[PDB]
Amino acid sequence: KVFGRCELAAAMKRHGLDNYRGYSLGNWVCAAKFESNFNTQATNRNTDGSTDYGILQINSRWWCNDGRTPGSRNLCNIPCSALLSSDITASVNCAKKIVSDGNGMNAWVAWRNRCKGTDVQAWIRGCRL
Numbered sequence: 001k002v003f004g005r006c007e008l009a010a011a012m013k014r015h016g017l018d019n020y021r022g023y024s025l026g027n028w029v030c031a032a033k034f035e036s037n038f039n040t041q042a043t044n045r046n047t048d049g050s051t052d053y054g055i056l057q058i059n060s061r062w063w064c065n066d067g068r069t070p071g072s073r074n075l076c077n078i079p080c081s082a083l084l085s086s087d088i089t090a091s092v093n094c095a096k097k098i099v100s101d102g103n104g105m106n107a108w109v110a111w112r113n114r115c116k117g118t119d120v121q122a123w124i125r126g127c128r129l
């Protein structure tokens, strides 16, 4: 599924991401835009052989099992394919574990390089929330 901007903002808010660990909703929408272009089916392969999955591009070396990343962990205890669903629940629940692990949203390279320190509230302007 390819979400619209405000549709994704509303879904993320319902799943408890607004101000989660202090990150306002616009941060999460900005991250999803530049990680996946709001596409739940996005996948991208990394040089180390791991793969990033879904709307928030969660990596198989640490967070999910895809059966082809040897020596990796599965800290969210899910198959990586569950992160590609049109239902974002699994992605949100795993993202909550990632953002809580000490490094905040710096875990997402596109957030660090394209959202951090910008007016992220612009990403939810005009939306009925």
Ligand SMILES: [Cl-]
Pocket (backbone or CB within 6 Å): 024, 025, 026, 027, 120, 121, 122, 124
């Ligand atoms: Cl915001």
Ligand SMILES: [Cl-]
Pocket (backbone or CB within 6 Å): 021, 103, 104, 105
């Ligand atoms: Cl933080």
Ligand code: NA
Pocket (backbone or CB within 6 Å): 060, 061, 062, 063, 064, 065, 066, 069, 072, 073, 074
């Ligand atoms: Na893994």
